[PDB]
């Protein structure tokens, strides 16, 4: 899909008709785009926090596992995700016996397949931003992504 959008944007002048139509597209589907971008950045920051030494010292079990409550309070102390985001991360994380979570696999589960689509979305947003300057809505999408 993003490949089609990029192909449409190919050969477009600054402030072109197709570029404006795609910006109107984005502001029409704002909530969907926000959810997708939030997904990508949430799992990126999750991978960053899994490797953080604060979360490492929060991890206590010698079997390389982090508890559900310990996981929640560790992300609370990081204070990077909002509460619904913490609940969504808890839902996505696997629940072993006694709600036991493998942080390494949780971080490295959704990063390989999402890498290509995240890169394509980044290319699309960079192309749109650099061909449609002075656009507050696209600036908002850039801030979210």
């Amino acid at each position: 899909m993003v490949v089609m959008l990029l192909s449409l944007l190919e050969g477009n002048v600054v402030n072109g008709m197709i570029a404006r139509q795609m910006v109107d597209m984005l502001v029409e589907s704002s909530s969907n785009v926000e959810m997708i971008l939030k997904f990508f950045d949430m799992f990126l920051k999750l991978k960053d926090i899994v490797g953080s030494e604060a979360f490492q010292d929060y991890v206590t079990d010698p079997r390389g596992l982090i508890s559900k409550k310990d996981f929640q309070k560790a992300m609370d102390s990081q204070k990077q995700f909002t509460g619904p985001e913490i609940q969504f991360l808890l839902s996505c994380s696997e629940a072993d016996e006694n709600e036991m979570i493998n942080f390494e696999e949780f971080a490295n589960r959704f990063q390989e397949p999402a890498r290509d689509i995240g890169f394509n979305v980044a290319v699309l947003l960079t192309n749109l931003s650099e061909h449609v300057p002075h656009d507050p809505r696209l600036r908002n999408f850039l801030e979210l992504a």
């Binding site: 953080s52 030494e53 604060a54 010292d57 102390s77 990081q78 204070k79 990077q80």
Partner: protein, 48 residues
């Protein structure tokens, strides 16, 4: 490696116009280091 010494010293920001640089660094890196490692490294007490 020698400036590592004045990280925890209470008189770190002396002879310098800014005296709250330690607090600012604590504020911006507590979310990463749990604020306790920052307190230990830069030599403050959070309650104090």
């Amino acid at each position: 490696q020698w400036d590592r010494l004045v990280l925890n010293t209470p008189s770190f920001p002396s002879n310098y116009w800014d005296k709250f640089v330690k607090r600012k660094v604590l504020d911006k890196h507590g979310d990463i280091f749990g604020r306790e490692r920052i307190a230990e490294l830069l030599g403050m007490d959070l309650a104090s």
